[PDB]
Amino acid sequence: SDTVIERHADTAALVAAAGDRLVDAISSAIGERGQATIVLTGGGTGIGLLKRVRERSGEIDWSKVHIYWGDERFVPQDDDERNDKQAREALLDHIGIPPVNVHAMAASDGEFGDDLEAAAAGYAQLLSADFDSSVPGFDVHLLGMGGEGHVNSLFPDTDAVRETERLVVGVSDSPKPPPRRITLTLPAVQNSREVWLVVSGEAKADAVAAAVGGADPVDIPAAGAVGRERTVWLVDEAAAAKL
Ligand SMILES: [Cl-]
Ligand SMILES: [Cl-]
Ligand SMILES: [Cu+2]
Ligand SMILES: [Cu+2]
Ligand SMILES: [Cu+2]
Ligand SMILES: [Cu+2]
Ligand SMILES: [Cu+2]
Ligand SMILES: [Cu+2]
Ligand SMILES: [Cu+2]
Ligand SMILES: [Cu+2]
Ligand SMILES: [Cu+2]
Ligand SMILES: [Cu+2]
Ligand SMILES: [Cu+2]
Ligand SMILES: [Cu+2]
Ligand SMILES: [Cu+2]
Ligand SMILES: [Cu+2]
Ligand SMILES: [Cu+]
């Protein structure tokens, strides 16, 4: 699998570039296969790039695009900490995507109640359904990365990042609030044609260098975030400073 690193000046430049790249990737996938399956992420740059996509959203036939999430905060549906809510405000509420093409992870006041394990297994069955229909399962899985290398809600040195069988798990004790999350696991992330890590800032530079260096994914979860066709690091100068 090829690896691409593309370094831009600063956060604003990075987010603009990443949004442009995503519009191009979605168009390319629709051209080749008649549809596109994309996995969204949260965090500042993950949501910021979606705002840029919104600027060019007329270039895409959204009836042909399917949306998943790599992780989600297991909190009430209307909570500001929700990744799906933030994505809807940034992009999804502004485009002609059919609601049934959008596959949000469950909320804690949703159909599974506050049962985290059931909610994770619910999304896993949905991915099994996607994975029964397409190979690889995803065209592009977007990711942010924390300073310690975490991606989705897979934190270093945890049973979640160690998971090799299940596609989705619950995390009940995230070291970063909120404590409860639903997350795709590395086997699910790795069933993407491309995995894109969008990373800004000095505090991320050590983890970028360790992940690109080919670290063990348990120690640096981002090192296991690898696409079947390519892995793309979209970074700014500050985050690239140890390459
Ligand atoms: Cl609000
Ligand atoms: Cl339980
Ligand atoms: Cu640039
Ligand atoms: Cu600037
Ligand atoms: Cu472009
Ligand atoms: Cu409420
Ligand atoms: Cu809140
Ligand atoms: Cu809040
Ligand atoms: Cu708002
Ligand atoms: Cu709008
Ligand atoms: Cu359901
Ligand atoms: Cu349970
Ligand atoms: Cu995270
Ligand atoms: Cu254990
Ligand atoms: Cu350092
Ligand atoms: Cu410079
Ligand atoms: Cu869908």
Author numbering: 2 to 244
From the reporting publication:
Here we show that addition of cupric ions to a 6-phosphogluconolactonase 6-PGLac bearing a putative metal binding site leads to the emergence of peroxidase activity (kcat 7.8 × 10–2 s–1, KM 1.1 × 10–5 M). Gratifyingly, this screen revealed one hit: in the presence of CuSO4, 6-phosphogluconolactonase bearing an N131D mutation (Cu·6-PGLac hereafter) catalyzes the oxidation of o-dianisidine (S5 and S6†). Simple metal salt addition thus suffices to endow a protein with novel catalytic activity, very different from the native activity.
Thus, 6-PGLac was co-crystallized with 3 mM CuSO4 followed by soaking with 12 mM CuSO4 (Cu·6-PGLac). The X-ray structure was refined to a resolution of 1.39 Å. The third copper (Cu1) is located in the putative metal binding site and displays a T-shaped [2 + 1] coordination geometry. The copper is bound to His67 and His104 (at a distance of 2.00 Å and 1.92 Å, respectively) and displays a weak contact with a water molecule (WATxx 2.80 Å), which is held in place via a hydrogen bond to the carbonyl oxygen of Val101 (O···O 2.81 Å). This structure also contains further unspecifically bound copper ions in the lactonase active site as well as on the surface. Although the STAMPS algorithm suggested a possible facial triad coordination, a T-shaped Cu coordination was observed upon Cu(ii) supplementation.
